Every structure is written in structure tokens, then in C-alpha cells.
Design a protein around this ligand. Structure first.
Ligand SMILES: *[C@@H]1O[C@H](CO)[C@@H](O)[C@H](O)[C@H]1NC(C)=O
Lengths: 50, 50
């Protein structure tokens, strides 16, 4: 059968899919000049980078 | 040091590439009037790239 174990497949997929979205949003720059903390620290001063 | 600057409605736009951006050669012309940077810091322009 192609998908008789779909329940276990749905379980192992929902965990990885939600976890990959968390890594995806790590590269998302929330209204900032850069998403990498090393890029903002290398471009702005502490009073402006905050 | 072009000795000739264009008007405000026909402003020039020089493109710079393939060279080391040594900004230390700027602070030997004369005491400036304004250096209000935006998006970056006037101090950390050395180690950055463009
Ligand atoms: C600008 O150019 C002139 C020659 O055209 C030179 O005498 C002068 O030193 C230059 N200015 C600077 C800041 O080097």
C-alpha cells in the first residue's frame, strides 16, 4: 500500500515542516536593514543598532 | 576635486568599482559642514564592503 502508514507519516512530517519554518523565519529581517546579527553590528553603532 | 559640479536638476552620478574604498582620503580636504550618514555609521565604513 502506498500510504497505509500515513498517520505516522503525517506525524513525522508536521514536526519537520514546523521546524523548517522556524529556521526559515530566522533569515527573515523583521523591519531591519539586515537579518544577520553580525551584519547590523558591523554597519551601525550600538545606540543605532539597538 | 573635479573643480566643476553640475546643477541640481542635471546632477552627475559617478559609478565606482574594482578598487579599495579607502575613506581616509576624504578627511584631508577641509573641515566639512555635514556628514549625516543613513543606514550605516560614519566610523565603521572602513571594514564594510559594497
Ligand atoms: C585637487 O587638484 C589640484 C590640481 O588640479 C591639486 O593641486 C590639489 O592638491 C587637489 N586637492 C587635493 C585635496 O588633493
Amino acid at each position: 500500500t502506498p500510504s497505509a502508514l500515513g498517520k505516522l507519516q503525517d506525524v513525522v512530517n508536521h514536526n519537520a515542516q514546523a521546524l523548517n519554518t522556524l529556521v526559515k523565519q530566522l533569515s527573515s529581517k523583521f523591519g531591519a536593514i539586515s537579518s544577520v546579527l553580525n551584519d547590523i553590528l558591523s554597519r551601525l553603532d550600538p545606540p543605532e543598532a539597538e | 576635486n573635479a573643480t566643476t559640479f553640475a546643477s541640481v536638476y542635471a546632477w552627475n552620478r559617478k559609478r565606482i568599482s574594482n578598487c579599495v574604498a579607502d575613506y581616509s582620503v576624504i578627511y584631508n580636504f577641509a573641515p566639512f559642514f555635514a556628514f549625516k550618514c543613513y543606514g550605516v555609521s560614519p566610523t565603521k565604513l572602513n571594514d564594510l564592503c559594497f
